[PDB]
Tab-separated table of C-alpha atoms and ligand atoms in Angstrom:
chain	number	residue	atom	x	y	z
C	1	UNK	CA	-15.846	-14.463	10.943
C	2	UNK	CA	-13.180	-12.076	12.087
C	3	UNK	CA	-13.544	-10.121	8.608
C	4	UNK	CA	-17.620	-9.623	9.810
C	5	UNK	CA	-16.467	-8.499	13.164
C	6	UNK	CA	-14.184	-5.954	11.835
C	7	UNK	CA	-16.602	-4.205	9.265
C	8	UNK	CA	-19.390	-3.996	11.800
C	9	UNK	CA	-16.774	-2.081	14.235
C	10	UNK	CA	-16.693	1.439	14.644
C	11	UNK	CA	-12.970	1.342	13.244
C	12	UNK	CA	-13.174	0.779	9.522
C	13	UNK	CA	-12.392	4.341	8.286
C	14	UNK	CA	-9.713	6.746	8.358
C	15	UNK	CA	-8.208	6.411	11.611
C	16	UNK	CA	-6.304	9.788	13.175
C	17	UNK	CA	-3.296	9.815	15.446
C	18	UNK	CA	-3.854	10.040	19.107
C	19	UNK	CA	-1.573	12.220	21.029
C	20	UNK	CA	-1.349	13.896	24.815
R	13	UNK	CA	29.479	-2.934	1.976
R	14	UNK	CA	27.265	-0.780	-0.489
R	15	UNK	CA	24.514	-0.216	1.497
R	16	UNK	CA	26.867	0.901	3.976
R	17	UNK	CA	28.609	3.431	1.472
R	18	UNK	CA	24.949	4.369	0.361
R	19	UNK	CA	23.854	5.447	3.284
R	20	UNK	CA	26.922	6.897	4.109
R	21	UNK	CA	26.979	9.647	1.514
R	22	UNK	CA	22.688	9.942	2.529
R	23	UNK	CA	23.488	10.994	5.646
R	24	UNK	CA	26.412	13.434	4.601
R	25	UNK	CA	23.636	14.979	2.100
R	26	UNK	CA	20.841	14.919	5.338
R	27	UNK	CA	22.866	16.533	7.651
R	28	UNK	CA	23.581	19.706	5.410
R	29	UNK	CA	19.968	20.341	5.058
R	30	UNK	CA	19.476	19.457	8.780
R	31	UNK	CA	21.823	22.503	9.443
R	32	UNK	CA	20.357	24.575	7.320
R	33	UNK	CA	16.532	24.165	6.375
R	34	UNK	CA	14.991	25.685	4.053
R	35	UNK	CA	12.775	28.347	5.061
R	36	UNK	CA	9.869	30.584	3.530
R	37	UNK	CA	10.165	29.378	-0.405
R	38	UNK	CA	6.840	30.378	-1.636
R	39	UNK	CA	3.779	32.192	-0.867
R	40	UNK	CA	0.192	31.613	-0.556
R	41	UNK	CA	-0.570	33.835	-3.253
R	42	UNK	CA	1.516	31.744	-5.504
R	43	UNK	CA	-0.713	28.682	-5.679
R	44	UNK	CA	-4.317	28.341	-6.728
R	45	UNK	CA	-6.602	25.707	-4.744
R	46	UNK	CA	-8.944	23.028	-5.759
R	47	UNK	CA	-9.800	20.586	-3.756
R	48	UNK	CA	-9.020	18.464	-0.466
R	49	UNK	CA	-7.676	15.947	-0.317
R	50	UNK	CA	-7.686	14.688	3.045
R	51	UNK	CA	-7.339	15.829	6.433
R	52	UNK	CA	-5.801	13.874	9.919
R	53	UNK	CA	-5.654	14.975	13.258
R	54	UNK	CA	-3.580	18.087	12.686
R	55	UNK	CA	-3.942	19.603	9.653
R	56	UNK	CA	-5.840	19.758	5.820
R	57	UNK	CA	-3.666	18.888	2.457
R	58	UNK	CA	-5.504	20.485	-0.652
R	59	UNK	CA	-4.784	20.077	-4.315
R	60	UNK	CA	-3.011	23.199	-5.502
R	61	UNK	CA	-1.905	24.257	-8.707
R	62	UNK	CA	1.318	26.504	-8.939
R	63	UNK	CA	0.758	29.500	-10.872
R	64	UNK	CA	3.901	30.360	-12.342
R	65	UNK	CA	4.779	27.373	-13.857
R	66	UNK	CA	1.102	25.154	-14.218
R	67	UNK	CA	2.305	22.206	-11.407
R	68	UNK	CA	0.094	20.452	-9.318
R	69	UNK	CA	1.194	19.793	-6.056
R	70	UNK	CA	-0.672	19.037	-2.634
R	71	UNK	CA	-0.409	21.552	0.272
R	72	UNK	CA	-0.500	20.597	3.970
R	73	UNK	CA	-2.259	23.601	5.979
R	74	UNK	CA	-2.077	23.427	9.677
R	75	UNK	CA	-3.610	26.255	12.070
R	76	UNK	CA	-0.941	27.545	14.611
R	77	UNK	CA	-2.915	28.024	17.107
R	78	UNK	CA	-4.113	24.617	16.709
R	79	UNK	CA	-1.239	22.901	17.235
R	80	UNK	CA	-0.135	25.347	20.553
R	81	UNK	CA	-4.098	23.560	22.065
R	82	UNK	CA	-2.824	19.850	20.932
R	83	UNK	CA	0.524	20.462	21.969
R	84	UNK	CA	1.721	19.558	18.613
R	85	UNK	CA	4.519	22.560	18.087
R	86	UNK	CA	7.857	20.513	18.854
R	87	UNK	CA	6.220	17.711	16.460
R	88	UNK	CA	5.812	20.514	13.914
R	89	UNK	CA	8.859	22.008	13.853
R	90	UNK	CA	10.135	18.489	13.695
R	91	UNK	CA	8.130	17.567	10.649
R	92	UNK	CA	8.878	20.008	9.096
R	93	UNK	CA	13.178	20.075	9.699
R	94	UNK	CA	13.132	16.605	8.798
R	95	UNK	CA	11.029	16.369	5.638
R	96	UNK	CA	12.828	19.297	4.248
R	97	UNK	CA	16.026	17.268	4.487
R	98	UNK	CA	15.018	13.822	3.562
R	99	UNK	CA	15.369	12.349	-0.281
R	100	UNK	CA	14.162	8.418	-0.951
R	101	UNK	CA	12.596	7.045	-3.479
R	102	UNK	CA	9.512	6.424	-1.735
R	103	UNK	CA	9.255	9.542	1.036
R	104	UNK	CA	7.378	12.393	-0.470
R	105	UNK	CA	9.109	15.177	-1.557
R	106	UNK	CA	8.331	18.494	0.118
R	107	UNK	CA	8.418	21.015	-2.554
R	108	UNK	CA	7.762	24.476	-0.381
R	109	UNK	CA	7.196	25.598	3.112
R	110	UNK	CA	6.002	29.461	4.259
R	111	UNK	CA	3.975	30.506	7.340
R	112	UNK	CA	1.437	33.699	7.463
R	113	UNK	CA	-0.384	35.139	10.247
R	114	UNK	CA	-2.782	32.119	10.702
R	115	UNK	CA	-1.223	29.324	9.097
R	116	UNK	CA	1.714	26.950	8.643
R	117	UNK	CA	1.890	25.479	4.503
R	118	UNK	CA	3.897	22.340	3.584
R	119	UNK	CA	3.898	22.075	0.377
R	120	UNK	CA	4.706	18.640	-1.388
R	121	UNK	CA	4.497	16.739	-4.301
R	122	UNK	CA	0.957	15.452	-5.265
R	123	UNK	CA	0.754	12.117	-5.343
R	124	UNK	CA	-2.248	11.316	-7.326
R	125	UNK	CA	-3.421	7.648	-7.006
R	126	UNK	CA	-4.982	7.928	-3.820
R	127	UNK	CA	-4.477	6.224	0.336
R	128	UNK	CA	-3.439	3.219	0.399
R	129	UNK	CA	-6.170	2.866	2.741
R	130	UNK	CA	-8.545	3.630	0.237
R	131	UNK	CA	-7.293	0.431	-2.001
R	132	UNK	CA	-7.096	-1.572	0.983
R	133	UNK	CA	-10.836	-1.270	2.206
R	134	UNK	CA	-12.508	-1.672	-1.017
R	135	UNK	CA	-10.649	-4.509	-2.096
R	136	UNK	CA	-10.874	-5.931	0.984
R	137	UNK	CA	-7.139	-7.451	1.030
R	138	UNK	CA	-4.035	-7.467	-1.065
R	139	UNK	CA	-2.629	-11.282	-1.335
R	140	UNK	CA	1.356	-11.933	-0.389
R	141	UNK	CA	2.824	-10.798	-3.768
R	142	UNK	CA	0.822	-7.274	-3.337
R	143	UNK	CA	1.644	-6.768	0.173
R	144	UNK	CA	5.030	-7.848	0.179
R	145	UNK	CA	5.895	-5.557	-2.706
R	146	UNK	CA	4.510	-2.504	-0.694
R	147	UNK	CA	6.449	-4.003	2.606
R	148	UNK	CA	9.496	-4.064	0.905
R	149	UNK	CA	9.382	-0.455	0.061
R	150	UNK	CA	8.751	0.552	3.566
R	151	UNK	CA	11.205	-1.948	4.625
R	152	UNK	CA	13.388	-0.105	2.522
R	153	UNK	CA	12.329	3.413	3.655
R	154	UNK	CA	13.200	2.692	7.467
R	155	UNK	CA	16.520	1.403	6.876
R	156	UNK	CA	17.135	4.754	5.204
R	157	UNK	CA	15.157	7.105	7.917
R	158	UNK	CA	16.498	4.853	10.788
R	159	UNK	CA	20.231	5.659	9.721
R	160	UNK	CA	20.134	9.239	10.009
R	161	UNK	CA	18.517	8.796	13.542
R	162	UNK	CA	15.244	9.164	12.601
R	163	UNK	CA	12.298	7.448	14.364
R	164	UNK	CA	8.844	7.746	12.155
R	165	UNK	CA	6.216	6.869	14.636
R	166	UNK	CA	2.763	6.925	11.954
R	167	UNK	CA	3.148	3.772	9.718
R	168	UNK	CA	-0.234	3.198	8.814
R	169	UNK	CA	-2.229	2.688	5.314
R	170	UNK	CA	-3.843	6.461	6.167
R	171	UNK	CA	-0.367	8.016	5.371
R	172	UNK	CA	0.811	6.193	2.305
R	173	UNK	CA	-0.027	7.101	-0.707
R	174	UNK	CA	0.073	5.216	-4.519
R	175	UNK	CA	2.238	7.267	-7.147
R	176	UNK	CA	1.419	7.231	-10.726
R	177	UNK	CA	3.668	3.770	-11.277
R	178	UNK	CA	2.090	2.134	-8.353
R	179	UNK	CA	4.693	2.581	-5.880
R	180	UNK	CA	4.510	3.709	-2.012
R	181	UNK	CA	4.945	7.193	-0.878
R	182	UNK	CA	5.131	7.951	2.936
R	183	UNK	CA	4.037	11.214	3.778
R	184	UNK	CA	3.081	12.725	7.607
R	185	UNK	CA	6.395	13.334	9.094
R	186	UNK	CA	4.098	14.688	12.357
R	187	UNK	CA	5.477	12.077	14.625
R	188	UNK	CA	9.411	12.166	12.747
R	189	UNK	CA	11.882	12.631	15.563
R	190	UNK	CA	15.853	12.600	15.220
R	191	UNK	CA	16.789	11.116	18.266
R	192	UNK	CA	20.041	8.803	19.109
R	193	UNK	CA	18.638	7.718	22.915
R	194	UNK	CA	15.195	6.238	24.001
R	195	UNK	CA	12.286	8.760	23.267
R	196	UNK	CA	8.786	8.474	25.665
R	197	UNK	CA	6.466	10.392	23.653
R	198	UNK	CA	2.693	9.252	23.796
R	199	UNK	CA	1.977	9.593	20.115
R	200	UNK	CA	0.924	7.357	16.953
R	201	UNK	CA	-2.392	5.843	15.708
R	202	UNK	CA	-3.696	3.072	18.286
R	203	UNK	CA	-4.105	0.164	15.984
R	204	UNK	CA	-0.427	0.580	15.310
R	205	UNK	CA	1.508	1.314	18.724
R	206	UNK	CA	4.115	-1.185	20.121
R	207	UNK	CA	3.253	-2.255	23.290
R	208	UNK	CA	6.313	-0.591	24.590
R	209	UNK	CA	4.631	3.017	24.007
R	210	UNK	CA	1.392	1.608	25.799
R	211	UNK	CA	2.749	0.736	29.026
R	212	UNK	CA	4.699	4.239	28.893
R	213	UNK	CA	8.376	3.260	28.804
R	214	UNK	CA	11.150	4.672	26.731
R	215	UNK	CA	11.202	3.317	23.350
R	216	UNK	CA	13.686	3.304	20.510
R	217	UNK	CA	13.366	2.416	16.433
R	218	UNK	CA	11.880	-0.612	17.310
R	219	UNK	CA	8.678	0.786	17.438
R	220	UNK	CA	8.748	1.395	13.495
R	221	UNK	CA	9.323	-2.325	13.030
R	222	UNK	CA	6.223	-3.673	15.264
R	223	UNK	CA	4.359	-0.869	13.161
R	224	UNK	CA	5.761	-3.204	9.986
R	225	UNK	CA	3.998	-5.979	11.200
R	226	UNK	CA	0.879	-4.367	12.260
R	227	UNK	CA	0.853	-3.243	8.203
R	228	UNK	CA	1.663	-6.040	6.501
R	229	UNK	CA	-0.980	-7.696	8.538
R	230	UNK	CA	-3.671	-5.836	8.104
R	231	UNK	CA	-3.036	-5.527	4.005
R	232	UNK	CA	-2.685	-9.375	3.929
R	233	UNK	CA	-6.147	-10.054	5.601
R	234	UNK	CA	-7.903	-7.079	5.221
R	235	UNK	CA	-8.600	-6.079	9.090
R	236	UNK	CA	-5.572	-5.471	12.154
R	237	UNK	CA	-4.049	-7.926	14.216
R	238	UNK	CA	-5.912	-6.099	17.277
R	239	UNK	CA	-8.711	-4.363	16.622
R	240	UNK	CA	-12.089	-2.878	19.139
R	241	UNK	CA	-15.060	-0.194	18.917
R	242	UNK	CA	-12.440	1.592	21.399
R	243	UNK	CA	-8.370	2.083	21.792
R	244	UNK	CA	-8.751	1.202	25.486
R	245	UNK	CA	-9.313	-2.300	24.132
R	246	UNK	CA	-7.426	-2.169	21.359
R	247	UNK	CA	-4.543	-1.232	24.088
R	248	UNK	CA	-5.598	-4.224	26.360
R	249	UNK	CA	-5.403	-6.691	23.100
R	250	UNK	CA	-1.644	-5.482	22.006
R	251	UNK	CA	-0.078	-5.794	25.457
R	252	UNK	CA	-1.393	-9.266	26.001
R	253	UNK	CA	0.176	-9.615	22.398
R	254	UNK	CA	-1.343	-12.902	21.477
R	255	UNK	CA	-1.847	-12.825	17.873
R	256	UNK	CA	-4.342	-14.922	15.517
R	257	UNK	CA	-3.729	-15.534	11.873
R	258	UNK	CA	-6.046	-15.594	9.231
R	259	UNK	CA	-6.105	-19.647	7.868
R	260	UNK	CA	-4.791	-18.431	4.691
R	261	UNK	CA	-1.559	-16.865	5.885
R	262	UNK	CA	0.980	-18.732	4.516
R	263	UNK	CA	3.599	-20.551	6.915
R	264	UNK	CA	6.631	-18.121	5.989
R	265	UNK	CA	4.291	-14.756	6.661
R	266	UNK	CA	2.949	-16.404	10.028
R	267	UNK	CA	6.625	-16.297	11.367
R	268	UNK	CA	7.834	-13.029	9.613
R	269	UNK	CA	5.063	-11.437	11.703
R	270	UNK	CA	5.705	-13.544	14.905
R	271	UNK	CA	8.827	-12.022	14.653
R	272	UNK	CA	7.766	-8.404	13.839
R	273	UNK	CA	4.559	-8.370	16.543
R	274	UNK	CA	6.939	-9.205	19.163
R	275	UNK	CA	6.576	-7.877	22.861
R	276	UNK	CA	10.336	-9.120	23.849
R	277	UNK	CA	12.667	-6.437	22.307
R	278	UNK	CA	15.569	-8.031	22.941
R	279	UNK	CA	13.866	-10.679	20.192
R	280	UNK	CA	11.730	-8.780	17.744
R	281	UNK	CA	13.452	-8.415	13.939
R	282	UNK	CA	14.802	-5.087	13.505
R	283	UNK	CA	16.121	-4.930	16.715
R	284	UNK	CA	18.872	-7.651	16.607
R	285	UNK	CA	22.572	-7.353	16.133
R	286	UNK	CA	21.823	-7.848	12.135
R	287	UNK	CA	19.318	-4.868	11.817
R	288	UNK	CA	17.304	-4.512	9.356
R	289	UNK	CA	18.908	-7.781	7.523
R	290	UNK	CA	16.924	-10.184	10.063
R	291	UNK	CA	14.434	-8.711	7.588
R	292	UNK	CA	15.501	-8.609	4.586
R	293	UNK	CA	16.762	-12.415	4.972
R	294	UNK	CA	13.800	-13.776	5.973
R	295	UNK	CA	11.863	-16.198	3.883
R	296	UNK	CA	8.833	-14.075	3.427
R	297	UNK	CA	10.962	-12.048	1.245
R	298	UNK	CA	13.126	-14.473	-0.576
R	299	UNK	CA	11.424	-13.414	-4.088
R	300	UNK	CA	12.332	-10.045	-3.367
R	301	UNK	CA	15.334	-8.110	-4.814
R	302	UNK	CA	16.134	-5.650	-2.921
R	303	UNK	CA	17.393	-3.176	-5.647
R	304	UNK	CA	15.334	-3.716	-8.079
R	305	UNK	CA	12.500	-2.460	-5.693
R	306	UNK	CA	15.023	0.570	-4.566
R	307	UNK	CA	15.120	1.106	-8.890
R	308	UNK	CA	11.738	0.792	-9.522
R	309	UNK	CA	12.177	-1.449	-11.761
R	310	UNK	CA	9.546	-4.154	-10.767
R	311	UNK	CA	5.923	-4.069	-12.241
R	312	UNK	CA	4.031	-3.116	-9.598
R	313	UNK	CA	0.729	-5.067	-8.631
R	314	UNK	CA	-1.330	-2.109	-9.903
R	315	UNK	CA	-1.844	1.273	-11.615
R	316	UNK	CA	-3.923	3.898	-10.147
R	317	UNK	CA	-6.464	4.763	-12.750
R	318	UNK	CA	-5.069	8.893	-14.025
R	319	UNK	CA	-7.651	10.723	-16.133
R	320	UNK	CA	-5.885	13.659	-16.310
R	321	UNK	CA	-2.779	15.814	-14.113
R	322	UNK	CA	-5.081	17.564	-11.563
R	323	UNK	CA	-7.375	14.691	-11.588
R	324	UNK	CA	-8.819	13.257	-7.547
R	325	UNK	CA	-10.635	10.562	-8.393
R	326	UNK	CA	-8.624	8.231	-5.958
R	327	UNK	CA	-9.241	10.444	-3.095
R	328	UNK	CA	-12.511	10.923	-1.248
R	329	UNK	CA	-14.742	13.866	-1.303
R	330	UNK	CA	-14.152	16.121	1.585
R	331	UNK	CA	-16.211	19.157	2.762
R	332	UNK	CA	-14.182	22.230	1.790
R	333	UNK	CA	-13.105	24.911	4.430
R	334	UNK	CA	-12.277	28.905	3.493
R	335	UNK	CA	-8.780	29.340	3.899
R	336	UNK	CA	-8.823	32.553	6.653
R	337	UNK	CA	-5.925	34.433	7.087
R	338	UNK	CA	-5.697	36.575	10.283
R	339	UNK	CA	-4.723	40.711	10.146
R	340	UNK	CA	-2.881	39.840	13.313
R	341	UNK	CA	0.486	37.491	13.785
R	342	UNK	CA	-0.400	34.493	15.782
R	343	UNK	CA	1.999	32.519	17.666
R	344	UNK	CA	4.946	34.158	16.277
R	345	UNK	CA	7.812	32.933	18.769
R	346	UNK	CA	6.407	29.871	18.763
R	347	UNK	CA	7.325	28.803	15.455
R	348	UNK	CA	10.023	31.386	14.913
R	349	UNK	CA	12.173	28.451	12.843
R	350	UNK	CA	9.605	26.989	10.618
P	401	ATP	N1	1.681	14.548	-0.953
P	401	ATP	C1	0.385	14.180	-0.904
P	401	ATP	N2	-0.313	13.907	-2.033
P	401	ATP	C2	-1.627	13.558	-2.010
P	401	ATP	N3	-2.337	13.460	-0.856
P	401	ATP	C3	-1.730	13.702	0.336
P	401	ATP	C4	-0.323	14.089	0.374
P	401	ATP	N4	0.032	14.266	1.675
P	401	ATP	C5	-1.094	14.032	2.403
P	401	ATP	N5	-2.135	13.692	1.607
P	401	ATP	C6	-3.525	13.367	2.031
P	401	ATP	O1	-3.803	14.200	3.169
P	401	ATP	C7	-4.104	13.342	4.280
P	401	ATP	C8	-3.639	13.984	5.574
P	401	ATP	O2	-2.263	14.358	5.445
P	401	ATP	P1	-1.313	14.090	6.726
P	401	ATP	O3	-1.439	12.596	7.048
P	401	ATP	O4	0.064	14.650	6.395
P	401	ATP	O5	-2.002	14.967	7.891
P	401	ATP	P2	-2.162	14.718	9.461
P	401	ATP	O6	-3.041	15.768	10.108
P	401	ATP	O7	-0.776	14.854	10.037
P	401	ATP	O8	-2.743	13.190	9.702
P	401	ATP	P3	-2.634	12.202	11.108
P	401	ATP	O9	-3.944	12.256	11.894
P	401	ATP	O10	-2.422	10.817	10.416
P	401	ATP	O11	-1.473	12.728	11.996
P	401	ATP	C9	-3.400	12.034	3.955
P	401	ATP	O12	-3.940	10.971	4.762
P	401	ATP	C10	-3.637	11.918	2.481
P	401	ATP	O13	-5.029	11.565	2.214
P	402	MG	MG1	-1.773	11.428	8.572
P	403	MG	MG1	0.169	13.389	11.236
């Protein structure tokens, strides 16, 4: 499932803004 | 026609304080610290309490000289001018601002019942009535930010926060610019970014309004509508643009966000000859009254648990950092204004 996917990713916390 | 006088006499009120910041209001001394509560790319907010008169209030400490290495000191200054300036019922309220030697101190309200983000992941996902509530209010809160000028550039469940009544407050102005032309600015979180910014052209307010449907997206089904281990591919997925719902999206939200995640400009809501109405008009939102959610008089979906006024119990546990304050000025031309 797309739900699985996401919480094995490396993006499930706190994301910070990119910049540059 | 009352919207329109609304926001006229807004703007009249923004503009004085645009002129004429406020600048230097407390001091560090004045404030005792607990805890922090978070930190982003920039800077560290702590729970402080105000000594004087026994308020709690949360204090955003960033280090000048890093912000001169990430090239962050226009952004600053901007934050800064424009949150000083703002008033809505769902933008935080910056209380304070100082500098010392080391450090730069925004200090706003505390707004104790945690991220959004926080609510988000362990739920999982808020259904329609939940997210549209919170939608609305950001709905709301562009309308108002994009009418003095302002682009926001950071939607994202990270910087909004869940008052005491369950309502939204925005906070991180970082990215805030007042700007009447196209702006070309790499900046924003990459889950987030139109694909506009991506492929590096100018961009207007429209990028607020993909943002929109990149958050009520991911609080509907609990994950983005693009999504990778790395932003590279997260980049590659947005610009191809091709979207896939969830099964349980219902009909009305499938073509609200069609309409939000949109790559044409000259077709994506927001950015129409009826603004921000395309919007509100849309069936999604049909349920919603507008004023009522500018009022705060709906019962919101839910209540932050409070145990007491300096209470964190919403935020996570971060590891503390002594607060050092330089003998020597640093970067003192640099942020002259702040
Ligand atoms: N007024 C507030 N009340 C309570 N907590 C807050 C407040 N303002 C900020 N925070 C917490 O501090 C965190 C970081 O603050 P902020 O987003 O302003 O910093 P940042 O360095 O600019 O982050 P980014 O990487 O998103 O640019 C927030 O995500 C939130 O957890
Ligand atoms: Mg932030
Ligand atoms: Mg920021």
């Amino acid at each position: 499932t797309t739900y699985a996917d996401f919480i094995a990713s490396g993006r499930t916390g706190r994301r910070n803004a990119i910049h540059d | 026609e009352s919207v329109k006088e609304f926001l006229a006499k807004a703007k009249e009120d923004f503009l004085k304080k645009w002129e004429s910041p406020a600048q230097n209001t407390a001091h560090l001394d004045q404030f005792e610290r607990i805890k922090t509560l978070g930190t982003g790319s920039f800077g560290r907010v702590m729970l402080v309490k105000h000594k004087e008169t026994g308020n709690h209030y949360a204090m955003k400490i960033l280090d000048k000289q890093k912000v001169v290495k990430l090239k962050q000191i226009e952004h600053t200054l901007n934050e800064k001018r424009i949150l000083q300036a703002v008033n809505f019922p769902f933008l935080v309220k910056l209380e304070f601002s100082f500098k010392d030697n080391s450090n730069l101190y925004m200090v706003m309200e505390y707004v104790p019942g945690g991220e959004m983000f926080s609510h988000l992941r362990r739920i999982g996902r808020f259904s329609e009535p939940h997210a549209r509530f919170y939608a609305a209010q950001i709905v709301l809160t562009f309308e108002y930010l994009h009418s003095l000028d302002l682009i926001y550039r950071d939607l994202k469940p990270e910087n909004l926060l869940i008052d005491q009544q369950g309502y939204i407050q925005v906070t991180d102005f970082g990215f805030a610019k007042r700007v009447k032309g196209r702006t070309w600015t790499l900046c924003g979180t990459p889950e987030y970014l139109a694909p506009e910014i991506i492929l590096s052209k100018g961009y207007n307010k429209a990028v607020d309004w993909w943002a929109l449907g990149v958050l009520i997206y991911e609080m509907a089904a609990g994950y983005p509508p693009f999504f990778a281990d790395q932003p590279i591919q997260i980049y590659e997925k947005i610009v191809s643009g091709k979207v896939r719902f969830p099964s349980h999206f219902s009909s009305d939200l499938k073509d609200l966000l069609r309409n939000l995640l949109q790559v044409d400009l000259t077709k994506r809501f927001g950015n129409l000859k009826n603004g921000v109405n395309d919007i509100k008009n849309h069936k999604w939102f049909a349920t919603t009254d507008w004023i009522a959610i500018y009022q705060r008089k709906v019962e919101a979906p839910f209540i932050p648990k409070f145990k007491g006024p300096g209470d964190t119990s919403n935020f996570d546990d971060y590891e503390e950092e002594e607060i050092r304050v330089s003998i020597n000025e640093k970067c003192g031309k640099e942020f002259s204004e702040f």
